[PDB]
Design a protein around this nucleic acid. Sequence first.
DNA 1: AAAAACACACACCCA
DNA 2: TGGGTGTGTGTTTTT
Length: 93
Amino acid sequence: SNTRNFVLRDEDGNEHGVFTGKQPRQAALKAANRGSGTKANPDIIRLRERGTKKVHVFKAWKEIVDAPKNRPAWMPEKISKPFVKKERIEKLE
DNA sequence: AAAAACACACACCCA
DNA sequence: TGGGTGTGTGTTTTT
């Protein structure tokens, strides 16, 4: 087992919080929570990976859609779906 | 193309 | 309270 953290950065060089996961799929998911505009509106952020020598940058957007179905009580109703658009993960060896 | 990331093995995983 | 498909372990999809 192994766990790589991620440090989300904004746009002006200022970084926000730090994630503690592993899979880029669910990591990029929470990155799109920027809230830039609404549905249609491009955005680009870069989370520095805290573990391996690699830069993480991807485009992502959110769409307000859904409704109270069978989601766990804490987070029901409707949520803006984030689109993990793999821009380019940099490499370093 | 080669590093970087994903496929189910299981069912998990945090406020 | 279970989303949505994680981690784990190998390699696969990525890049």
